[PDB]
Amino acid sequence: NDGYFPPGTSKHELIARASSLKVSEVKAIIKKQVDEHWDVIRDVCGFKNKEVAYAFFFGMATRESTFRAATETGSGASHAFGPLQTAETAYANANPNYMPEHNVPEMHQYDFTEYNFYDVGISVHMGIRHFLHFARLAKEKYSGRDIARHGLMGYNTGWIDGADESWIVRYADETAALGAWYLRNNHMSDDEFTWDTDPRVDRSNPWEIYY
Ligand SMILES: OC[C@H]1O[C@@H](O[C@H]2[C@H](O)[C@@H](O)[C@H](O[C@H]3[C@H](O)[C@@H](O)[C@H](O)O[C@@H]3CO)O[C@@H]2CO)[C@H](O)[C@@H](O)[C@@H]1O
Ligand SMILES: OC[C@H]1O[C@@H](O[C@H]2[C@H](O)[C@@H](O)[C@H](O[C@H]3[C@H](O)[C@@H](O)[C@H](O)O[C@@H]3CO)O[C@@H]2CO)[C@H](O)[C@@H](O)[C@@H]1O
Ligand SMILES: [Mn+2]
């Protein structure tokens, strides 16, 4: 039951309706997916509880889209849509040159179709799956916070290793810090959001809250 909008909704309407979703509604979509997939999320990432897992994915929504669910960027393998900026590489049958993601059997891999790419519900499901693809690769060589940290580097770059430490900080550590703002300031359900570089956000020891 992953799709949010009616099957058959046009591309234009999927985008327009995503654009009009309230922040609280995007948070609810993310929570639904985290609830549905908690066991695999916990097994891969070792997050302490569902609440901090919600916050982690709110951090991703913040870093990727500033909670603007109709955000669309990139080209080819980087072409991404939705609150988590789910790339085409997440999807089954998208392009023969995309590296396969057959290591998350706990989550269905939706086919690459207009509805599956542009529906916010499918997009969020697939973003979580795509992140777990890379986090599971990271767990082969990393532990603790480094699973999620390098999983995020894979999500954004295609590669769990080899990014600059300064992008690990500006992208992955930023994501962790942004997510914690929601938990610490009672924004887990309301329409409030933070943003990349917001000076209010506490960036010290940004991973500790999750474990
Ligand atoms: O490269 C990582 C991801 O970046 C996403 O873009 C984000 C920008 O990196 C981020 O700086 C920007 O933050 C803005 C915010 O949108 C604005 O409202 C505020 O006033 O200033 C902030 C700092 O400049 O947010 C965008 C996301 O909305 C890409 O969308 C994503 O594809 C990419 O992976
Ligand atoms: O050399 C190995 C194979 O590489 C394939 O290209 C991959 C890029 O190397 C990788 O950087 C890119 O990663 C995407 C990522 O999947 C996505 O989530 C993010 O938004 O954008 C990243 C790029 O900025 O994925 C591609 C495809 O898997 C070549 O296509 C392949 O021929 C080659 O064998
Ligand atoms: Mn799902």
Residue numbers in the entry: 140 to 350
Give excerpts from the publication.
RtGH124 is the defining member of CAZY family GH124. Unusually for R. thermocellum, RtGH124A is not targeted to the multi-enzyme cellulosome complex of the organism but instead consists of a ‘dockerin’ domain which instead targets the enzyme to the cell surface of the bacterium, followed by a CAZY GH124 catalytic domain; RtGh124 is therefore an unusual enzyme if its primary role is in cellulose degradation yet it is not part of the cellulose complex. Here, we show that the metal-ion site of GH124 can accommodate a variety of metal ions (but not Ca2+) and that the histidine is modified by a carbonyl group at C2 to make 2-oxohistidine (but only at a fraction of approximately 0.5). Metal binding also occurs with a stoichiometry of approximately 0.5 (in solution by ITC and in the crystal through occupancy refinement) and we are thus unable to deconvolute whether the 2-oxohistidine is required for metal binding or antithetical to it.
Manganese is coordinated by Asp141, Gln172, Glu175, His176, His264 and a water molecule. In several structures with other metals, the water is at a very low occupancy or is absent, while Glu175 is often found in a double conformation, with only one of its positions coordinating the metal. The reasons for this are unclear: it may reflect pH, the partial metal occupancy or histidine modification. High-resolution structures of RtGH124 (1.40–0.94 Å) have revealed an unambiguous modification of C2 of His264. In the case of manganese, the metal and the His264 modification both display partial occupancies of 0.7 and 0.3, respectively. Occupancy values were similar for other metals under similar conditions, varying from 0 to 0.5 for the histidine modification and from 0 to 0.8 for the metal.
